[PDB]
Point group: C2
Chain length 123, copies 2
């Protein structure tokens, strides 16, 4: 089993220049706490979490209407290759203490894999 | 075992009129994701989470520098008495779907108990 086999494919990557307020809207829209952030051509720049917006954004004196997703997401760059094994995915999740990881193929975001996805497809 | 036995006593209740930006600063200071909010009467009004600020605040078109903790915490009221049992704490956590619960005694916030506190001291 590979990341490509269990990932949620076709997820939209939020632009690095989008504001934190805009990112907050996407999180409400999809009811999620982390968004993959990209530059041009679906190139992954990092992950932005809801807590990031509060702690690294609001609590750091940034204006959510001008501070960008990229400014905060560039602090968190982790991912797995589309051919990564379950063990590898868990390794990344463990090290970074996260429940979901971006999947990359040819430098482009191709999907997102969650810990729940792994639990569902072990057999 | 009671709530008073495993709670984090002496935590400060954030004022209902404090802004969301102020609330975020407190969450950073203590590295926590939820804050107990109290009114001018010192009575608990609710809990404000980091996600609440993002979803009920920013995503709802509110200005974090003007919207208040109290306006977002109003509909998130739950707690346990200081003499509450582990089962009671679990009932509140399960039913409200939360991991942090404020502890009250004589109508005053005396601490916060977490699921981790329970697991650790279980």
């Amino acid at each position: 089993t590979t990341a490509r086999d269990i990932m949620n494919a076709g997820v939209t990557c939020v632009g690095e220049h989008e504001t934190l307020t805009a990112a907050a809207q996407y999180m409400r829209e999809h009811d999620i706490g982390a968004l993959p952030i990209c530059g041009d051509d679906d190139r992954l720049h990092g992950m932005l979490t809801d807590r990031d917006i509060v702690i690294k954004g609001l609590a750091a004196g940034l204006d959510p209407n001008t501070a960008t997703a990229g400014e905060l997401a560039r602090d968190s760059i982790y991912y797995v290759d589309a051919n990564a094994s379950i063990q590898e995915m868990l390794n990344v999740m463990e090290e970074h203490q996260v429940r979901r990881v971006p999947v990359i193929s040819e430098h482009r975001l191709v999907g997102i894999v969650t810990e729940a996805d792994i639990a569902r497809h072990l057999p």
